[PDB]
Amino acid sequence: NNPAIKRIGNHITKSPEDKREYRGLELANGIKVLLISDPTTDKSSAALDVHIGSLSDPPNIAGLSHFCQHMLFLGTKKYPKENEYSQFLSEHAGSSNAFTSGEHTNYYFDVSHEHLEGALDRFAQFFLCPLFDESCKDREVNAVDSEHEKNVMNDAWRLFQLEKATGNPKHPFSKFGTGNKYTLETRPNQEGIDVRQELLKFHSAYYSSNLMAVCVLGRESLDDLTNLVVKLFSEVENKNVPLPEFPEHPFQEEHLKQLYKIVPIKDIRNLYVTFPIPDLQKYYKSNPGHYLGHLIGHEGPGSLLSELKSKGWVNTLVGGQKEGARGFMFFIINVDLTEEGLLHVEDIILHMFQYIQKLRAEGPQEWVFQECKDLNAVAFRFKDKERPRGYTSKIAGILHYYPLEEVLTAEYLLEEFRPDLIEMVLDKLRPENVRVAIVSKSFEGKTDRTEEWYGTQYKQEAIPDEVIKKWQNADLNGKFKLPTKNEFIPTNFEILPLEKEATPYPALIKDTAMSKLWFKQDDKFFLPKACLNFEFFSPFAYVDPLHCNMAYLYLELLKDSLNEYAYAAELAGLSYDLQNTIYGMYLSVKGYNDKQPILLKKIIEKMATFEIDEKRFEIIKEAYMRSLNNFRAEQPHQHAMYYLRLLMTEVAWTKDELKEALDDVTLPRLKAFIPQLLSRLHIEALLHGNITKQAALGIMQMVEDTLIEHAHTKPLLPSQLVRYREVQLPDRGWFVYQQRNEVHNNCGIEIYYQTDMQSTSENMFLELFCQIISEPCFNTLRTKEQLGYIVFSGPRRANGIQGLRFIIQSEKPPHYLESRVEAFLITMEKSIEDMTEEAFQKHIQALAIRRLDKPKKLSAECAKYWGEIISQQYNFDRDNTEVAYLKTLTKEDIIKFYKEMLAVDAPRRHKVSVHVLAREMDSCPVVGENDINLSQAPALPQPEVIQNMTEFKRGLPLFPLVKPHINFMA
């Protein structure tokens, strides 16, 4: 019947827990579509994935594909406004993003469910009639350049491009995909290329319906969704473009048995081992590559990491298959190196080949395959409901690899055991097909090459035949054994019935001097999972720099100790997070509830009776020191945020103070610290999930009793439960703190306009104002003025206080950046004065939907509750309360708020700026003094420059703490 539809797939296989409706189909023009109906979703979503990416970039214009991606958002013939798309999403509680990989360009958005069509319509035009406006092209070229600039000093990106540069230079795999001003503007200009036309050509050439996949999720019925999608996408032209292919591997003969010595930016020590392998994608029903990754990358008893770590050569390891593109893949085994490890690379690699030999000797094991198959089946059946935005994006991408009916199960459900495929891949992991790369500062000055796109310094040597020979003769090592049955595999999935006394929010069911227990039995997701969150309060975790280092070292030593045993629980879907905080310790255990008690008990017991291995202590301490120093390699904007934090918090140890005190922590010192840290404590926890009240009280008491029995822990005094305060800036004050980033050649800045203490009133004024300026901020500071790639605005919340912050990373100096933000602020004042009452009411509605958007899974709902507990505000009904209040604000209230707290002449303006200067910038003024279509920046007062943080805080008062919310019950 319907000529617009080539076919409607059969029933889409889903989990019996998934209440969403599904319908797959293929349009006449060849677009693969997956429709999703969720009548309860608050936000609708859509995504389109074109099966063409940077790998198809024309040789003479590197990055064109990524630039085409950016440009599609800047206007279409049907919707000309450069920001019609983003503005429409913003006003309807939506958002959007897009990415470019070697073979894909994925576009997606989410929006209030009531505006799916308006959003989908504007979105569809991207693939029908983009304008590629000449003025937008000239401006947007800077965003792309800015994007590359932040990556230039990033070790991961440098290594990513270096591998590409080190393969066959004729293979498209060697292309630079990001692109920058040089490749997108300069170069083409000095070669008479009209990028506008090149974008038009590329778009007209590859954006063919036959290479597109779409996924839409909304409240509408499947029939309504179908007509909707047929109506907006059946008009995309099918140009029958052949799907790009790359059968010849980028690493050929001359590229194997090669060794690379690389100089990193951060002080890191890594060893990368790569093997070229065939494309294994078509074998998704068996996944031979993952089978070997599961074994080679295994942690736990008898594993490769175990021996490497015992020999004190390695700390972490990653093994498995790495994607390439249609036609080729790689198999990697990457390890980090200890100092000793750096000097034993040859032995480390032999151990790898010894372990691989064991795999060949034992042969493929079906029980291992069965185990993963069972685990994956359980994971699929009980998979958490995804957020619409990420879900549609993911489906659109994988619709290109699997039949419509299997698009949900293909990546989870295993079906075939393939000892033949497994052996075939194992036969590619041999010394004569290996590539080895070492990353270490020790290579500084010894390199003879440079990677052109990032400037990476390295040396390339052939591996001597004898070394290859020694590896080829690897024999069985008695230390290497295959894993044993995974005893953490869950088997009990019953959902306890909802107790009669069940509450909508966490209830306080234990309030003792030793512990405060918040509890809630899951009443909406119904999966066999639970979240056990614990907060251990102790003044000694952050009393001084030395103890902060010990709190950290201790927990890091503990996790390194439990790793081998915890890995099994990990594969079985039971993980935990343990870290030190400025108030003590944080422990989180989540996953299938079945075996959580066992993992938890083990952690606490281990914690309270810990024995530190001296060798592990020196190694982890050396890494921690390196980690503290490496902060200098972080980006300018991250430095700005770090500084503001140190500046506004009553107590905070800098990274310089931490490493200085690090030489003082000795094994003896750490051993004394632990028992002292555990002697006096207070525990506040939230147990949320598939568990009863008595199981919860039981778990809480088991934790206390373990600590009491092994560490003689006693309660902490209530007045000892202290929370840090935020510095109170003076009315009409403006302070500036300036610093320099010595790695990145970009400037960073954070502007913080402190308002007042948090409260229903203060909160909504600030949030409404942020909702109204959000998209305009991006459109003004980035799209129009192109200050940088990183342009951010939003509320800042800390220690119960709040305010508006702006964060920008750019080539332009901080004082200039400041001027533009002040100019923008004026533009927003006028703008708000000029907007209609309905437009105002529209933003209120948008904010409301964002705040009332319901969590789709247990961990997300838990997180919201945990946030109320940690902040000690315990306002569980905050969203309904704050929204009800938000719907009462008038345009006048926001104008008053701005004129009183934000305007340059506001009586209560509390401003602080953090200026981070670029590497190649000696000095720079703190304040500075035409009309190139740029708004007029107001004149600024003279700022008081901060020389010493400690003095700065001493001469200022401290805000009080926010009062709790009354949540009564025994």
Binding site: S101, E147, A156, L317, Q321, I790
Partner: peptide, 11 residues
């Protein structure tokens, strides 16, 4: 562990 780069439009 077992193995499991794109550029974006937006920070």
């Amino acid at each position: 562990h077992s193995q499991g780069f794109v550029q974006w439009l937006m920070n």
